[PDB]
Amino acid sequence: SMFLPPPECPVFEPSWEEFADPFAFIHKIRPIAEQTGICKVRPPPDWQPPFACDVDKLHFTPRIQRLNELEAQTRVKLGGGGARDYTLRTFGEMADAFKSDYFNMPVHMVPTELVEKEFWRLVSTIEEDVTVEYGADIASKEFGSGFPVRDIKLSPEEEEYLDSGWNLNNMPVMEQSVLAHITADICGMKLPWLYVGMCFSSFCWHIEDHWSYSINYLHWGEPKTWYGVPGYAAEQLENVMKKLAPELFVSQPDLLHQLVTIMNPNTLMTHEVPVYRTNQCAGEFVITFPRAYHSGFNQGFNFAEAVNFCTVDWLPLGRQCVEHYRLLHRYCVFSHDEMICKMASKADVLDVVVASTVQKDMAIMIEDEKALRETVRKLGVIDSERMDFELLPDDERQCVKCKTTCFMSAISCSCKPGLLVCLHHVKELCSCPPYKYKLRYRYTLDDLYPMMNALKLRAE
Ligand SMILES: O=C1Nc2ccc(F)cc2[C@H]1O
Ligand SMILES: [Cl-]
Ligand SMILES: [Mn+2]
Ligand SMILES: [Mn+2]
Ligand SMILES: [Zn+2]
């Protein structure tokens, strides 16, 4: 045997009743699905959103992909990056001819088992040099969501699906999520991405920014094959990866140079990393859990739509993730503390389970901040001044040393205008004596305790 398929991940078939509320359902399956990292969700037979579009008027700029195991690729950036151009129809014609010519078979007579074995053969063989193309970008005027959105008059059926929880345009900005409260520009993370696939086009092993959840819907076409690893095994996987492809682990100059790669799940299984698989067919959802590594490839021409989200469950993990970024010197997409304080400042209109969970995260934030400020005072930093960090562009408030986005506090020095360090890296700013430094802070401890009290009242 040259490829042993991993065991299958969990598959859920909710009733209409269960399927009514997405967040309730995800909370239900969570103890099972978080053991496997990914899971598949089949909607009720009824639930059939209308996909409709003109294949001649949708155009997009294709990305090109070489298919070599352990070779470095860079995560897709929101920028089009292209002079070349396909309509959905001309891409479909390219994609079907490619698959048909590769196997000398009609496109739907190629078994999924065989495409999977062939994918892993061709990525491991050096002389084979297959390149494929694919589409990836957030919605725009030239290529929009596959779900119904408001604007054009809509049919009664379209109106049914316009407000669904499972309409992925809605899911980021619903109530039991926490990304919706963020006022910062985080386009890449709260807007759905649109993916046009062809045979063998693939996505490298990765986890979502800030260890968020994600959910992917296959609108139409041939299936999408997935591999997933549970969150508790993320560091095992990373150690296996570091050993075999250490170049992917050199320091990131920014978030547009994140390096990722294809790697055979059998390799992971040999090093005792648990891995699960699934084929996602048209009309099905795949959900990924916090810090669950995933990868996959398309069986043929298809169209998927995916979005990030964060439940109240995720809040403690969000804080651990930012700490982990600090240890690695990795850039943040947003400030976690800034998001917590924003929610606290809206305590009266918050859902009450949300208020209760924000309260507990804020209590940890405040006790850590108390300890850090005492430490830098003992270093001889005496002068201080309030500062509205949320007004600075992100690139003007990153720690010089660990790149974290400052919000609660930072240290500055008149000696190096415009530069900041977080309170973990006070000794990294410059060589002036500590009495020349200034502590810049968003809130006094006395501002903070009443903010947390408002949450306590709302939670009762
Ligand atoms: O379903 C997919 N996920 C994903 C992720 C990143 C990519 F560049 C491309 C894809 C799609 O094929
Ligand atoms: Cl190859
Ligand atoms: Mn993903
Ligand atoms: Mn350090
Ligand atoms: Zn720092």
From Swiss-Prot:
Q: Report residues binding Fe cation.
A: H206, E208, H294
Please describe the organ and tissue distribution of this protein's expression. Answer: Ubiquitously expressed, with highest levels in testis. Down-regulated in melanoma and glioblastoma. Up-regulated in breast cancer (at protein level).
Q: Where is the JmjC domain?
A: 160-326
Q: Where are the zinc fingers (C5HC2)?
A: 399-451
Q: Which residues form the JmjN domain?
A: 9-50
* Binding-site residues, 2-oxoglutarate: Y134, S214, N216, K224
Which compartments does it reside in?
Nucleus
What note about domains is in the entry? Answer: Both the JmjC domain and the JmjN domain are required for enzymatic activity. However ARID and PHD-type 1 domain are not required for activity per se but contributed to recognition of the H3(1-21)K4me2 substrate peptide. The 2 first PHD-type zinc finger domains are required for transcription repression activity.
The record's note on quaternary structure and interaction partners says: Interacts with FOXG1B, PAX9, MYC, MYCN and RB1. Interacts with HDAC1, HDAC4, HDAC5 and HDAC7. Interacts (via PHD-type 1 zinc finger) with histone H3 unmodified at 'Lys-4'; the interaction is inhibited when histone H3 is methylated at 'Arg-2' or 'Lys-4'.
Q: What does this chain do? A: Histone demethylase that demethylates 'Lys-4' of histone H3, thereby playing a central role in histone code. Does not demethylate histone H3 'Lys-9' or H3 'Lys-27'. Demethylates trimethylated, dimethylated and monomethylated H3 'Lys-4'. Acts as a transcriptional corepressor for FOXG1B and PAX9. Favors the proliferation of breast cancer cells by repressing tumor suppressor genes such as BRCA1 and HOXA5. In contrast, may act as a tumor suppressor for melanoma. Represses the CLOCK-BMAL1 heterodimer-mediated transcriptional activation of the core clock component PER2.
**Into which family does the record put it?**
Belongs to the JARID1 histone demethylase family.
Disease implicated: Intellectual developmental disorder, autosomal recessive 65: A disorder characterized by significantly below average general intellectual functioning associated with impairments in adaptive behavior and manifested during the developmental period. MRT65 patients have moderate to severe intellectual disability, developmental delay, and facial dysmorphism. Camptodactyly is present in some patients.
Recorded protein name is Lysine-specific demethylase 5B
| Organism of provenance | Homo sapiens (Human)
Span of the full-length protein shown?
A: 26 to 753 of 1544
